[PDB]
Amino acid sequence: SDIAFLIDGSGSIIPHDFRRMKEFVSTVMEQLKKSKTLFSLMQYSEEFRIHFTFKEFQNNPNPRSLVKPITQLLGRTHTATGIRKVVRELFNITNGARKNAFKILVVITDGEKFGDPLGYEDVIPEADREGVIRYVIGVGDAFRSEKSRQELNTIASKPPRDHVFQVNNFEALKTIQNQLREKIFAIEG
């Protein structure tokens, strides 16, 4: 499995909630680390940060090591654009990504996609094509609406009830590790 992480570095996320976020991620990588599993991370906002590719991870496969040194981005939310860059570069052959393997994407966001030229319509359709499975963790009040949830039901793979986890706040992410974990195991064993 080519398991990649897309995390929201929006400056709407207070340093420690962002601290937490970061700890969540380390933990799941260690928790899902099979032998042939690869990992990659990028930090998206208004600027886009590749912290590491599959290709790298295999010559230093240590979640605590690589997760540790990340720096927040603060800008706004270009989720769609972020998606396009995952598919477009993370999941490319020269980046470690292996062709006969499962493509998995886990997104973590705290708001709605603000000020993005692209849309889900522009990026969604090409993610399916190469067949990327998408699981979305949405965090906070921003997601309590009868429309905010739509954006989340949308970045997800179908069915959405099994791909979406609407948590209450940074702390409260520890609460779904077993879930998010077992769902990603079941599709490899």
Of residues 84, 103, 134, 163, which one binds its own copies by CB under 8 A?
84
The residue among 23 and 46 lying less far from its own copies, judged by its C-beta, is 46
Secondary structure class of 103 (helix, strand, coil): strand
Residue 50 interacts with, from its own copies, Mg ion, none (CB under 5-8 Å by kind): none
Quote the tokens at residue 104.
């998995």
Report which DSSP code applies to 74. Answer: B
Residue 117 binds which entry of its own copies, Mg ion, none, CB below 5-8 Å type-dependent: its own copies
Do strands 48-52 and 2-8 pair parallel, antiparallel, or not at all (unpaired)? unpaired
DSSP E strands, 9-46: 38-44
69 belongs to the binding site for its own copies (CB under 8 A): no
Residue 10 contact, options Mg ion, its own copies, none, Cβ 5-8 Å cut-off depending on partner type: Mg ion
Mark residues 120-159: x for contact with its own copies by CB under 8 A, - for none.
--x-------------------------------------
- Return d(Cα 184, Cα 180) in angstroms, integer: 7
Q: Is 50 in the site for its own copies (CB under 8 A)?
A: no
Cis peptide before 15 (omega within 30 of 0): no
